[PDB]
DNA sequence: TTGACTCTCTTAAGAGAGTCA
DNA sequence: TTGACTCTCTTAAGAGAGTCA
């Protein structure tokens, strides 16, 4: 809703609820040839999922308050930033999974940014093998490496030059 | 269907007319502050194009023969690969240019690999910053760098660990 | 047979809003 | 007021097919 009191209110009501998830430990490449520990914060698979959340999409969830008899709703992950910018350089922001887990709501693993920055993460070598994200990544992300290139750069002929 | 022979001709009349495009010189950065050079051949940017091409997108244009009496027709950039694999590991193989310049249609500027693995590139090092990629980068990603996020992992209270 | 247009679709990272009870 | 569903949309890397002369 419109104050700023209001707000905060929200985003602790969500803090509240997301705190009850259960609380999952995923083990994580970072880079480097080194693992760490994540503790993801998971929406439940199903109704009931918590206070104000239902879901919208296979992997989408919208969180729902009524405040001065308005219902006011927002993507789920988009709550802990409700005070931020909602662009940067007229691109629009997006919650961001630093642990590329999408059920999880756990704050601390959500970052607010473009949707290209968002989706490079997919394939950063991350926090101990390069990663140059000015938000640091949790870890290595999940389409890092050499690739499955079927064909490369070739011609029949003479007419190209790299 | 067409032979192999009438695939090849094919290849041979495309690279015949993308050969006489408009030849670009473009400095480009490779990488551990290393600059380089790529050699873009640039469809028209208007009608005509060139024997054979007509745009069906803003930057998407189709290639077209007629074979005994049967108009066939093929993504302006997948004919270098008529005669590769056109999946792998259950995904479809997409042209991916590694100059990230969509009008060019050098074929040594393209490889033929998944969508996952075309999108990755733009965020890449490039060749002499830690390109990883078995057919390597000609350039480094034109997204590749810090990122411009607005807002990192936060919580206001006390219910969540990293 | 060819050119120059037209339309909609795929993917996987993200969104908004309506219908009922 | 709250819950549990429904639907379509955005983006930026890529696609296929129709009409007309
Ligand atoms: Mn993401
Ligand atoms: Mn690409
Ligand atoms: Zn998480
Ligand atoms: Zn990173
Ligand atoms: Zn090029
Ligand atoms: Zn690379």
Redesign the pocket.
């Known amino acids: 809703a419109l104050t700023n009191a209001q707000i905060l209110a929200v985003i602790d009501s969500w803090e509240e609820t997301v705190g009850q998830f259960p609380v999952i430990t995923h083990h994580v490449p970072l880079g480097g040839g080194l693992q760490g520990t994540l503790h993801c914060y998971e929406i439940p698979l ?4 918590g ?7 296979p992997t ?1 969830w ?1 969180y ?3 405040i001065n ?1 308005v ?1 006011h ?3 789920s ?2 709550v802990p930033f409700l005070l931020e910018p909602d662009n940067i350089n007229g ?2 922001c ?4 630093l642990c ?1 887990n ?1 059920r999880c709501h756990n704050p601390l693993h959500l970052c607010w940014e473009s ?2 920055d ?2 490079g993460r ?1 394939w950063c070598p991350g926090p101990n093998g390069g990663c140059v994200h000015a938000v640091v990544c949790l870890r290595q992300g ?2 890092y490496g050499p690739g499955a290139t079927v064909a490369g750069p070739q011609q029949r002929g003479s007419h190209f030059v790299v």
């Open positions: 199903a109704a009931p999922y206070v104000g959340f239902a879901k919208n999409g989408r919208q729902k308050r009524t008899q219902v709703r927002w993507g992950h988009t691109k629009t997006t919650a961001s999974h590329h999408t949707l290209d968002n989706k997919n999940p389409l």
